[PDB]
């Protein structure tokens, strides 16, 4: 052994489950809402199913300049009106 | 007799907390429609 309490002990203790029957679902719900609110989309810049193309466009918004790439993506985004 | 907030505790949780959050996210994603 190396001093820490056995996991066998912990995960079968009543207390552990009192704590984690709260904390585990809490987190889970938080991740859920992170998606369902749409927050994720905006945090990582990921296209919603209606934001990959404009209505009549079929050209991928490929980044083509290195240093003005940011303005390029911003333009690509404004292109969806 | 036993400590609670060991190095092991930390390691365990830096892995486990994000994992449950992430699984909640992916769960949610399963009901997204085009």
């Amino acid at each position: 052994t190396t001093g820490e309490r056995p996991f066998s002990d912990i995960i079968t203790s009543v207390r552990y489950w009192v704590i984690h029957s709260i904390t585990i679902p809490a987190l889970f719900i938080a991740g859920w809402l992170f998606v369902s609110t749409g927050l994720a989309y905006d945090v990582f810049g990921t296209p919603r199913p209606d934001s990959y193309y404009a209505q009549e466009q079929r050209s991928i918004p490929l980044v083509t300049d290195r240093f003005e790439a940011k303005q390029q993506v911003e333009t690509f985004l404004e292109q969806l009106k | 007799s036993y400590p609670i907030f060991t190095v092991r505790w930390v390691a365990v949780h830096t892995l486990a907390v994000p994992t449950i959050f992430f699984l909640g996210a992916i769960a949610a994603m399963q009901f997204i429609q085009r």
Binding site: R15, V18, I19, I22, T23, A26, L27, I29, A30, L33, F34, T37, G38, L39 | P3, I4, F5, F21
Partner: peptide, 30 residues
């Protein structure tokens, strides 16, 4: 941004909760 408070409210409620439940043993340890 309301979505960050809505989403990361469960996490901070879990943290506050477990802090409440483990506080005496944590104080005893520290």
């Amino acid at each position: 941004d309301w979505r960050v408070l809505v989403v990361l409210l469960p996490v901070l409620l879990a943290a506050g909760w477990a802090v409440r439940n483990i506080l005496p043993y944590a104080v005893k340890q520290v």
